[PDB]
C-alpha cells in the first residue's frame, strides 16, 4: 500500500534478530573517495550501482 | 513565475516525482498536493 | 505503469508590486534665519 501515496517512498523494514548489531539486516558496504576524486563523481558512482 | 519555457495548457508533475524517469509511459491522476481548490 | 498526479496550468494575468524603504519629507519647508544682527 506505501506504493500507493504517490508522494515518498516508504520503506517498513523490521529490526534484525539481534538488535545491538544495526537497525536493518543485511549487508552494508562504503563506497570510499580513496584518489580523491570528487563528490560529483562519486554521486554518479553510486548511480550506476544501484 | 515561469519566464520561458514552458507551454501554456501543458501539464507538468506533482506527485511520483521520484517513482519516475524520463522515458517511462505513466498515467495521469489529478493530484491532490497542491493547496488551491 | 508507475501512477503520477498532475496539474494542469493555464495562462492568466498577474500584476508585479515592488516594496521599497523611504522617509517621508515636509512638502514645502522653511527653517527661518535672523537675517539680521541684534537681540
Do not use: C, W, Y
Not at chain 3, 512638502?27 to 527661518?32: D, L, N, S
Amino acid at each position: 500500500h506505501f506504493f500507493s501515496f504517490k508522494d515518498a517512498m516508504v520503506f517498513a523494514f523490521a529490526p534484525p534478530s539481534v538488535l545491538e548489531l544495526g537497525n536493518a539486516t543485511g549487508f552494508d558496504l562504503f563506497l570510499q573517495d580513496q584518489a580523491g576524486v570528487g563528490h560529483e563523481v562519486l554521486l554518479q558512482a553510486r548511480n550506476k550501482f544501484l | 513565475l515561469v519566464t520561458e519555457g514552458l507551454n501554456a495548457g501543458d501539464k507538468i508533475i506533482t506527485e511520483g516525482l521520484q517513482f519516475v524517469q524520463p522515458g517511462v509511459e505513466v498515467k495521469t491522476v489529478p493530484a491532490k498536493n497542491v493547496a488551491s481548490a | 505503469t508507475p501512477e503520477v498526479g498532475i496539474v494542469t496550468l493555464e495562462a492568466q494575468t498577474v500584476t508585479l508590486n515592488t516594496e521599497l524603504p523611504g522617509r517621508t519629507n515636509a512638502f514645502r519647508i522653511a527653517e527661518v534665519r535672523p537675517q539680521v544682527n541684534g537681540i
